[PDB]
Write a protein that binds this ligand. Structure first.
Ligand SMILES: CCCCCCCCCCCCCCCCCC(=O)OC[C@H](COP(=O)([O-])OCC(O)COP(=O)([O-])OC[C@@H](COC(=O)CCCCCCCCCCCCCCCCC)OC(=O)CCCCCCCCCCCCCCCCC)OC(=O)CCCCCCCCCCCCCCCCC
Ligand SMILES: CCCCCCCCCCCCCCCCCC(=O)OC[C@H](COP(=O)([O-])OCC(O)COP(=O)([O-])OC[C@@H](COC(=O)CCCCCCCCCCCCCCCCC)OC(=O)CCCCCCCCCCCCCCCCC)OC(=O)CCCCCCCCCCCCCCCCC
Ligand SMILES: CCCCCCCCCCCCCCCCCC(=O)OC[C@H](COP(=O)([O-])OCC(O)COP(=O)([O-])OC[C@@H](COC(=O)CCCCCCCCCCCCCCCCC)OC(=O)CCCCCCCCCCCCCCCCC)OC(=O)CCCCCCCCCCCCCCCCC
Ligand SMILES: CCCCCCCCCCCCCCCCCC(=O)OC[C@H](COP(=O)(O)OCCN)OC(=O)CCCCCCCCCCCCCCCCC
Ligand SMILES: CCCCCCCCCCCCCCCCCC(=O)OC[C@H](COP(=O)(O)OCCN)OC(=O)CCCCCCCCCCCCCCCCC
Ligand SMILES: CCCCCCCCCCCCCCCCCC(=O)OC[C@H](COP(=O)(O)OCCN)OC(=O)CCCCCCCCCCCCCCCCC
Ligand SMILES: Nc1ncnc2c1ncn2[C@@H]1O[C@H](COP(=O)(O)OP(=O)(O)O)[C@@H](O)[C@H]1O
Lengths: 97, 103, 54, 319, 344, 120, 169, 140
């Protein structure tokens, strides 16, 4: 974990760099967004497991349950967008200028 | 917290499980339960501003039960020398490493 | 000195300084990628602001 | 009041609908005899008949109901429309814009009666059949191109929200014929109507109005002879299937919101007052302020309905 | 909306901030933030106009990544202290993350780009909720953790917001976006005093809520999203012209009205704490905010813009009234100043 | 700030300790202001809703002048307590930690020599 | 073997590198699945079975199947852009190698990596003679000890349906 | 990598101008990079090169204002022999204002710039002289 918690953390930052620099398809962000939730879920589960802190295992899952719906909302917005613009491409999302 | 509707109502839906020394299921004590207690019964009645200087012995220890980095260091240091010493042929693992086995 | 020099210097200049500053800060594509990247820059600088003043 | 509370507890439009809960708008030329037909159609099927919406369809609907002074009602003359086409002041466009606002009020009042009572409504000409006058006016020197754009913008902003006419009974006495009818009638001005105007209006009905509402709503065109006989048409209206039409998706929980719109006249025509400053439409601050201080000072208008003592309202000190 | 759905959503949009405030286990504070994100998105697309889908998709991505960053801070803390909550010992970077993240959800400073755009594509009503009942949640989390956050960053985000908000507002003519910009600015003052006297943040918020809620129900009474639209207020409904005038000058800091108190006591507290550098620059550009407020004043009240004949028609019809809240929140806001000592 | 104080009532409006403080005189200028603040709210409402300004809702006018005032007595009653706690807290500390707040001595103006800057 | 966890952790990072470089949406999805499995094995390496396997059930086949599903109807075909998928592949490979040397560099800074201390820390302490100390016993506090954690999540799902249907409508 | 900038303040003003100018030039340049970055992230360019150019322009312009500020203030101090004088800085601030003006090819900007920038720099000197505290810790 000393260096196994640095890989996961950098994974979250590499996923951070991803969600923040868009490119074309919006799905790739959402998908990326999810890459973080996995990294957070893995790190939370890892430390809870090596702290033998069983009282906290509820959290690793609450994180996933909330993250799943969060993503559900995200995809419905995505479907709504390629119903209004025929694509998920972000450039289209420039009307509010 | 910002609106303590919990203390007022007496309910404790969010406090019972905030620290490693809270009730663990089947009373399987956590790790560092020897310290967090010692570091929160110390900082009880003494506010943070003064839970941060005088109750530093118990956090410096609890910062080491969990992180357990000084150990890692000492150990890592030990190995290095053992590596160098083993280079000179000075250190030869004892058969104790492969001795009898205590029940 | 009245009218032009004392109106171009204090009252009018301050009018222009701002007008121009709003024009650059508010001329935004509206595209999300651009905006977001700016969030990236911010995270970077704040990471540093903490780092250097550790 | 009508609101979610009422809707939550019953007060559902769907429960109040029936074979004859429909909107039938009969549209024709300058004189298509459509009023007569509309009246009868409404009676035969037991539906409310809404008179054509004139420059004053709003004062009658609001307050005393007594004809407001011209300047209070937007200073529009159909009379001046005819005697002075392409006028410097543009009374013709102001007449058309007020007319669109009047039918917007009439259509909304009609929808409110339809969803509340459940009774159907015959509205003669509608917001849907107003464009033919403007199309003909632009085809003529009456209105300029931007004037057209301003009406189209108001139409695009407000008309889509309201549900379409269920069916659009139509009469088609030709321009030569109508010109004859008008002349036989005594109106000194109506008679100065350019024949071309009549034709252009007719065209915009056939080239645009009937095909365009035909796919979204049932269309029943009848010639002069057919209309004289409403019964004939009533039959057709009854055999109508109202199969197509955006009306099919109007569930109760959807009607509620539409009702709450028509229930609020101030919104129905909210986009009718959009701040687009074309010169004919602009009242002008000094003239507008005066007309307001004067319209707002009329008895029963200086305060909300129920609170102005002039007309005999009482209990104001506890309302 | 099937009234049932309306209830579930509205309950969530309301359980969302309330769980955040009540709980102490940060995790439970995070899901409170998460529920607010999920509940607001359906309402945002109610018209389902092409502009709306854009609004929600931006609001959601901005909100979601910030939510993930806040969770990372909680996850990291869990390993630097077994506790699920920030403590004196917390690594400084851990807290700074929470500031940036929470300053994105609240939309302060260099993350102020999403708010003006989502405020532009949502209805006036959902605009209010998106501006004022969604700021309570994140601010609660910050106010709780104030003892630990950095004085430097907050100040920078504070000053930046004030500037960005002001400068942005000067150019804007769409009302929804003028308000979005004001909110960025006021939000800035609020976060300036958080490290020093959180109790004043809660005043500079309430007053902002008691000022903005009347201001928006005013904008929608005539549903005018344009200044030109609000300028014809004199014809559509003349009485609100008087209070709209005072509330907007109150939103800016002019002295007789209630709006001065938040700026005055924040400046008094910052000078008490010696930031006479920072406080001075903030107050100065705060004056820029009043310029665009008064420019609107000019169009709506002090000068009468020309109106349209079709307006006479809207006058005829009885104007659906403004709820009572407008009055009670207009007066308590425009003039409570004589009662400042007890407010603070 | 004042939160975290010993004995703090976690969600209470005004702890009974505030009973010791004098009650706000009903005619306290402030409560009277709240009254006027209220009457105006009422009048304003009538105006925005286009009703005779003063002669209408005479029942409402009362609800307003009487709601605001009611609120006042019970609010001021508290804010008065909060301020009173502040002294209890402040004065106490000055003593418990006396050295830090010593009573310095001020010399008579005779002894003190203040530089005289002539105006000329 | 002692590096079993470092390696897995390393591959995870790469997996995430892939998602970041934003390859074609569906291939990116494949990436999240690869990282997903790697991750599951990580949690399954520190002693947690339920938490891990759940990752599989809810997230590997459960959640991303959806992602791939929607990435089937709405994310177009990533058409005329497929070529980059090769460039992205390269940078990924190059980046991986970069990191390879990178961590070697960080390893140099003894002042964590515990190059020698690898396999000495995946686990720290265990109730050697214990019986009911299995990941999961904890996950169940959600029904009894901690229920808040369930009442909150439950509301989420419930409200979720109403929300998604409302957004979708 | 911070012990550096601070050095500017440690040695008395007017002395060791070399260091002063170097430090001031860096700060300006750093700001240049950051400024260009925001300028490129938002209001993007048309081609990679075009933007690289921007970055360069903004960086150099900022580096220049940094240099002249540093050089002018140091030199003025040395020549005027006033080791600590707010004006010295003003001369320098004005100088930066002018530079910026030139790089923007505008006399007017130079006017705006001379007063505003100078005033600002002068205030920095006063700030240091009077021990003004910026971004202070909460001490209530
Ligand atoms: C630092 C402070 C500065 C203050 C001034 C600056 C700030 C305020 C500026 C306001 C204006 C800003 C610019 C907006 C546009 C103005 C021009 C415009 O187009 O206005 C259209 C607008 C159109 O409205 P309208 O169509 O006439 O609608 C009303 C109907 O006609 C029906 O009307 P009616 O004739 O039936 O109404 C009769 C009613 C009219 O009543 C009112 O209008 C009350 C208005 C209160 C406003 C308070 C503002 C406070 C600001 C701080 O009579 C009364 O109620 C008498 C009592 C009124 C007292 C008001 C002052 C009380 C102060 C305390 C006195 C001492 C204490 C004891 C009091 C005892 C009382 C018995 O004109 C107005 O009505 C303005 C109303 C508000 C006047 C405020 C005057 C405040 C003076 C201070
Ligand atoms: C959006 C968010 C949600 C909405 C907002 C929510 C806001 C509030 C959130 C509250 C969060 C939880 C707060 C409480 C937990 C944390 C604080 C704490 O420490 O309390 C622990 C405490 C533990 O349980 P307990 O209340 O002590 O158990 C009752 C007795 O003490 C048990 O002792 P016992 O020995 O009497 O055992 C009972 C047994 C005893 O049997 C015998 O031994 C017989 C011989 C002795 C007879 C005399 C004693 C027994 C008398 C009969 C039983 C009476 C007690 C049991 C009553 C059960 C029903 C309350 O007899 C029975 O088996 C009765 C069975 C009744 C079955 C009812 C099934 C209902 C299913 C759902 C229907 C549709 C809805 O409270 C709970 O955790 C349970 C209440 C909270 C339930 C979850 C949250 C519900 C609110 C959210 C609903 C919406 C969720 C949407 C997602
Ligand atoms: C954690 C906390 C993190 C906090 C982070 C805060 C970051 C603040 C920076 C901006 C943030 C994002 C943003 O909204 O900027 C949009 C902004 C949009 O500009 P643009 O779209 O590239 O300009 C359009 C045309 O290219 C414009 O045509 P143009 O480019 O030809 O016009 C400029 C022209 C002519 O220039 C002029 O005549 C006016 C010169 C004004 C100089 C001072 C500007 C900044 C004033 C700050 C106070 O001279 C030049 O071409 C450039 C020559 C080299 C100049 C190098 C200056 C570097 C300044 C770095 C400032 C860093 C923040 C302080 O991006 C920036 O330029 C960023 C720097 C300036 C931002 C505008 C001023 C905002 C100041 C608010 C208070 C900040 C300080 C107190 C806190
Ligand atoms: C960053 C630094 C601050 C910002 C600097 C640039 C500011 C100007 C930006 C202009 C617009 C973006 C293009 C130039 C910047 C860039 O490197 O590309 C980002 C990339 C753009 O994607 P695309 O839509 O193809 O745009 C091509 C435009 N010619 O978008 C993407 O890369 C999407 C994927 C983002 C995450 C990729 C993986 C990041 C980690 C890689 C390994 C670690 C690298 C460490 C360094
Ligand atoms: C020492 C004495 C210092 C005196 C300073 C005086 C400042 C105000 C002078 C006048 C400024 C002004 O009139 O701004 C108007 C300008 C153009 O906008 P406007 O006139 O509203 O619209 C065009 C006409 N319809 O609008 C603008 O360009 C911006 C207006 C800024 C107003 C002053 C802000 C000062 C901020 C200080 C920080
Ligand atoms: C007392 C204060 C007096 C200030 C000077 C008064 C006279 C100013 C003047 O006459 O020029 C106004 C200036 C003219 O510039 P112009 O020829 O239009 O060319 C613009 C090219 N961008 O107007 C302009 O168009 C240029 C405006 C430039 C504004 C920015 C100049 C630098 C500001 C630095 C502020 C401080 C930064 C550090 C803090
Ligand atoms: N939008 C409009 N523009 C101009 N004139 C209109 C408009 N709408 C109705 N009119 C006029 O109103 C008059 C009455 O309409 P109609 O009912 O067809 O005549 P009648 O009442 O004699 O049957 C018509 O002569 C027509 O020219």
């Amino acid at each position: 974990m000393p260096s196994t918690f640095f890989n996961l953390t950098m994974a979250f930052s590499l996923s951070l760099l991803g969600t923040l620099m868009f490119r074309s398809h919006l799905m790739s962000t959402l998908l990326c967004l999810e890459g973080m939730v996995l990294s957070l879920f893995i790190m939370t589960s890892v430390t809870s497991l090596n702290s033998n802190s069983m009282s906290s295992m509820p959290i690793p899952i609450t994180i996933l349950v909330f993250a799943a719906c969060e993503a559900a909302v995200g995809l419905a917005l995505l479907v709504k967008v390629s119903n209004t613009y025929g694509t998920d491409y972000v450039q289209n999302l420039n009307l509010l200028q | 917290p910002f609106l303590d509707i919990q203390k007022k109502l007496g309910i404790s839906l969010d406090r019972h499980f905030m620290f490693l020394s809270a009730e663990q299921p089947y009373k399987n004590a956590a790790r560092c339960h020897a310290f967090e207690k010692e570091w929160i019964e110390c900082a009880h009645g003494i506010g943070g501003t003064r839970a941060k200087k005088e109750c530093k012995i118990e956090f410096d220890d609890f910062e080491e039960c969990l992180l357990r980095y000084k150990t890692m260091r000492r150990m890592h240091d030990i190995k290095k020398q053992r590596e160098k010493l083993m280079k000179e042929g000075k250190y030869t693992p004892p058969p104790h490493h492969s001795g009898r086995e205590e029940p | 000195l009245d009218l032009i020099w004392l109106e171009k210097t204090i009252p009018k200049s301050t009018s222009t300084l701002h007008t121009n500053m709003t024009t650059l800060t508010t001329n935004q594509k509206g595209l999300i990628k651009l905006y977001f990247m700016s969030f990236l820059i911010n995270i970077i600088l704040i990471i540093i602001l903490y780092s250097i003043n550790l | 009041r009508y609101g979610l509370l009422a809707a939550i507890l019953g007060d559902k439009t769907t429960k109040k609908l029936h074979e004859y809960s429909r909107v039938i708008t009969v549209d024709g030329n300058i004189c298509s005899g459509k009023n007569k037909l509309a009246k009868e159609i409404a009676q035969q099927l037991g539906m409310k008949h809404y008179p054509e919406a004139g420059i004053q369809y709003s004062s009658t609907t609001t307050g005393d109901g007594r004809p407001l002074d011209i300047e209070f009602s937007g200073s529009c003359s159909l009379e001046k429309f005819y005697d002075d086409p392409k006028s410097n002041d543009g009374n013709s466009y102001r007449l058309q814009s007020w007319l669109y606002a009047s039918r917007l009020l009439q259509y909304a009042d009609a929808l409110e009666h339809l969803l509340s009572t459940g009774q159907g409504v015959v509205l003669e000409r509608s917001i849907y059949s107003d464009f033919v006058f403007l199309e003909a006016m632009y085809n003529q020197g009456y209105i300029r191109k931007q004037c057209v754009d301003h009406y189209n913008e108001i139409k695009r902003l407000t008309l889509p929200e309201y549900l379409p006419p269920h069916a659009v009974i139509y009469i088609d006495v030709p321009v030569p014929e109508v010109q004859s009818r008008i002349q036989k009638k005594g109106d000194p001005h109506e008679m100065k109507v350019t024949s071309a105007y009549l034709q252009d209006i007719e065209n915009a009905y056939k080239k645009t109005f009937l095909p365009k509402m035909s796919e979204m709503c049932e269309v029943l065109v009848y010639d002069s002879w057919e209309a004289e006989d409403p019964t004939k048409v009533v039959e057709d209206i009854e055999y109508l299937k109202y199969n197509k039409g955006p009306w099919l998706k109007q569930d109760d929980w959807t009607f509620h919101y539409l009702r709450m719109l028509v229930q609020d006249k101030t919104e129905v025509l909210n986009y009718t007052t959009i701040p687009v400053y074309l010169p004919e439409i602009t009242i002008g601050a000094h003239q507008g302020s005066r007309i307001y201080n004067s319209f707002r000072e009329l008895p029963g208008r200086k305060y909300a309905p129920g609170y102005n003592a002039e007309v005999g309202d009482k209990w104001i000190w506890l309302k | 909306m099937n009234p049932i759905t309306l209830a579930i959503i509205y309950f969530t949009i309301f359980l969302g901030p309330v769980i955040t405030m009540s709980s102490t286990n940060l995790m439970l504070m995070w899901v409170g933030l998460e529920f607010s994100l999920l509940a607001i998105i359906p309402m945002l697309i109610n018209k389902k106009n092409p502009r709306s889908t854009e609004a929600a998709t931006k609001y959601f991505v901005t909100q979601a990544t910030a939510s993930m960053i806040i969770l990372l801070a909680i996850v990291l803390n869990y390993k630097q202290l077994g506790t699920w909550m920030f403590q004196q010992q917390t690594n400084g970077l851990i807290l700074n993350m929470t500031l940036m993240a929470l300053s994105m959800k609240l939309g302060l400073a260099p993350f102020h780009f999403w708010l003006p755009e989502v405020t532009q594509g949502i209805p006036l009503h959902m605009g209010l909720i998106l501006l004022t009942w969604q700021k309570i949640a994140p601010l609660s989390i910050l106010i709780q953790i104030y003892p630990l956050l950095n004085s430097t960053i907050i100040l920078m985000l504070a000053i930046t917001s004030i500037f960005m908000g002001a400068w942005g507002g000067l150019n804007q003519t769409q009302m929804r976006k003028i308000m979005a910009y004001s909110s960025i600015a006021h939000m800035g003052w609020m976060l300036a005093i958080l490290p020093y006297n959180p109790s004043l943040t809660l005043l500079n918020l309430m007053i902002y809520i008691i000022l903005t809620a009347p201001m928006f129900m005013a904008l929608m009474l005539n549903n005018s999203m344009t200044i030109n639209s609000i300028s014809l207020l004199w014809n559509k409904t003349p009485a609100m012209l008087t209070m709209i005038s005072l509330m907007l000058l109150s939103l800016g800091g002019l002295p007789p009205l209630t709006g001065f108190l938040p700026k005055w006591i924040i400046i008094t507290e910052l000078m008490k704490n010696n930031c006479l550098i920072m406080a001075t620059l903030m107050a100065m550009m705060a004056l820029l905010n009043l310029f665009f407020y008064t420019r609107l004043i000019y169009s709506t009240s002090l000068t009468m813009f020309p109106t349209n004949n079709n307006s006479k028609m809207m006058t005829h019809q009885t104007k659906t009234k403004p709820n009572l809240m407008f009055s009670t929140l207009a007066i308590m806001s425009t003039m409570t100043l004589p009662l400042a000592p007890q407010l603070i | 700030m004042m939160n975290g104080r010993p004995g703090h009532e976690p969600l209470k409006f005004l702890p009974d300790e505030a009973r010791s403080l004098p009650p706000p005189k009903l005619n306290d200028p402030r409560l009277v202001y709240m009254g006027l603040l209220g009457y105006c709210t009422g009048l304003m409402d009538n105006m925005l809703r286009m009703r005779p300004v003063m002669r209408a809702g005479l029942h409402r006018q009362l609800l307003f002048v009487t709601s605001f005032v009611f609120a006042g007595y019970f609010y001021l009653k508290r804010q008065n307590y909060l301020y009173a706690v502040k002294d209890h807290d402040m004065f106490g500390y000055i003593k418990l930690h006396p050295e830090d707040f010593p009573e310095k001595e001020k010399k008579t103006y005779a002894e003190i020599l203040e530089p005289f800057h002539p105006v000329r | 073997m002692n590096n079993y966890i470092f390696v897995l952790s390393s591959l995870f990072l790469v997996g995430c590198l892939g998602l970041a470089l934003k390859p074609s949406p569906i291939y990116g999805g494949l990436g999240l699945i690869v990282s997903g499995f790697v991750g599951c094995l990580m949690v399954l390496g520190f002693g947690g079975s339920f938490l891990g396997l759940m990752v599989f059930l809810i997230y590997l086949g459960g959640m991303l199947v959806v992602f791939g599903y929607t990435t089937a109807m709405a994310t177009e075909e990533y058409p005329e852009t497929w070529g980059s998928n090769w460039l992205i592949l390269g940078f990924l490979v190059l980046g991986v190698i970069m990191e390879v040397f990178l961590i070697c560099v960080l390893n140099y800074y003894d002042e964590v990596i515990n190059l020698d201390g690898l396999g000495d820390w995946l686990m720290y302490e265990v109730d050697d003679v214990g019986v009911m100390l299995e990941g999961g016993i904890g996950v169940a506090a959600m029904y009894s000890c901690a229920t808040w954690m369930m009442v909150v999540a439950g509301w989420s799902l419930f409200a979720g349906i109403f929300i998604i249907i409302e957004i979708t409508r | 990598v911070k012990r550096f900038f601070e050095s500017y303040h440690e040695v008395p003003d007017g002395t060791q101008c070399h260091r002063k100018t170097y430090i001031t030039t860096a700060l300006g340049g750093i700001c240049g990079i950051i400024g260009s970055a925001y300028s490129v992230s938002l209001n993007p360019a048309d081609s990679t090169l075009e933007a690289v150019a921007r970055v360069g322009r903004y960086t150099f312009t900022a580096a220049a204002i940094g240099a002249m500020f540093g050089l002018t203030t140091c030199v003025s101090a040395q020549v005027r022999e006033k080791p600590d004088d707010p004006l010295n800085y003003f001369i320098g601030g004005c100088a930066g204002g002018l530079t910026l003006g030139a790089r923007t090819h505008s006399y007017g900007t130079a006017a705006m710039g001379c007063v505003y920038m100078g005033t600002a720099a002068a205030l920095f000197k006063i700030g240091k002289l009077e021990g003004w505290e910026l971004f202070p810790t909460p001490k209530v």
